[PDB]
C-alpha cells in the first residue's frame, strides 16, 4: 500500500548515477537519472552531495537546501527535492539538470554562438535573478560565471547557493569570519578587509561577472590572472591578499576587455565602487542594461 504526498522526496533506489558534472561549494554535482518505473522513461537530474562531510557542513547543506527551495524564478536553478540516501542516514540535493553547464565553460566552448547582444541578455538575466534574491534578503556571496548555469542559448540561471546568507532582519550586512579559501578575486574591498557581505558586495562581484562575460573567458584575461599579473606573479600566500587590498583600496581595477564598449566598462566601474552605498542596485542595473539593449536594436 502506497500514498505519495511528497514529490520532493526522491527514492534512493531509483536514483541512478550516470556521470560526474563538477565541483561546487564544499561538494560535488553529478548527473543522475530518476526512474521509479524502471522503464527508462524517467528524467535526468543534477544531484549535489557533500565531500569530506561533517556535522557543521551538513547543517550548512540543510540551510542551502532551504534557501534553494524558497526560490522560484526563471533565472534561478530549480530545486526539485531531496534524497535521504544511505538508508536515510545521509542527505543529497536534487536540482534541475541544465545541459550546457556553467556559463564560464559555455562561453569558452561556444564562442561561435556568442555576441554582445547575447552577453547583455545574460547580464540582464543575472541582474533579475539577483533582484529576486534581494527580496528574500539573501546575500549570494559567490557570484561568478562558474556558478551561473546555462539552460539554452537564450537563458542563464544563477546557481551554487552554498555560501548564501540571510540578513538578520535588523541589519544590512552579514559578517562571516571563515577559515579556508575564499574567492578573493571576486570580493569587494570590505569583504576582504572586514568580512562584511551585503547586497552591495554582490553588486561588486556582479561587476566582475560582467568583466568575465566581455573577456569571453579568454585565459590570461581572467580576474585571477589579471590581478596576479598586476600584483606580481611571484607573490605567494598572504602577500597576495595584502597587495590586492592595497591595489583595490587605491583604485586599481581590472582593465577594460578588448572590444568591450566604453558604456559597458562604465557599468563595471560603477559596481566596483569602494563606497558601498554609491554602488547601483540590481534594479538600476537590469533597467540600464535592458535600456541599452532596447536602444541598440535599431
Ligand atoms: C558544472 C556544473 N554543471 C555542469 N552541468 C550541469 C548540469 N546541471 C546542473 N545543475 C547544477 C549544476 C549543473 C551542472 C555543476 C557544478 N556547478 S556548481 C553551480 O555546483 O558550482 C556548476 C555547474
UniProtKB/Swiss-Prot annotation:
The modification Phosphotyrosine is found at residues 34, 132, 138, 173-174. Ubiquitously expressed throughout most tissues. ATP binds at residues 21-29, 48. The active site is at residue 142. Residues 15-290 form the Protein kinase domain. Possesses 2 protein kinase domains. The second one probably contains the catalytic domain, while the presence of slight differences suggest a different role for protein kinase 1. Interacts with EPOR, LYN, SIRPA, SH2B1 and TEC. Interacts with IL23R. Interacts with SKB1. Interacts with STAM2. Interacts with IFNGR2 (via intracellular domain). Interacts with LEPR (Isoform B). Interacts with HSP90AB1; promotes functional activation in a heat shock-dependent manner. Interacts with STRA6. Interacts with RHEX; this interaction occurs in a erythropoietin (EPO)-dependent manner. Interacts with ASB2; the interaction targets JAK2 for Notch-induced proteasomal degradation. Interacts with MPL/TPOR. Non-receptor tyrosine kinase involved in various processes such as cell growth, development, differentiation or histone modifications. Mediates essential signaling events in both innate and adaptive immunity. In the cytoplasm, plays a pivotal role in signal transduction via its association with type I receptors such as growth hormone (GHR), prolactin (PRLR), leptin (LEPR), erythropoietin (EPOR), thrombopoietin receptor (MPL/TPOR); or type II receptors including IFN-alpha, IFN-beta, IFN-gamma and multiple interleukins. This is Tyrosine-protein kinase JAK2. It comes from Homo sapiens. The gene is JAK2. The chain holds residues 835 to 1132 of 1132 of the full protein.
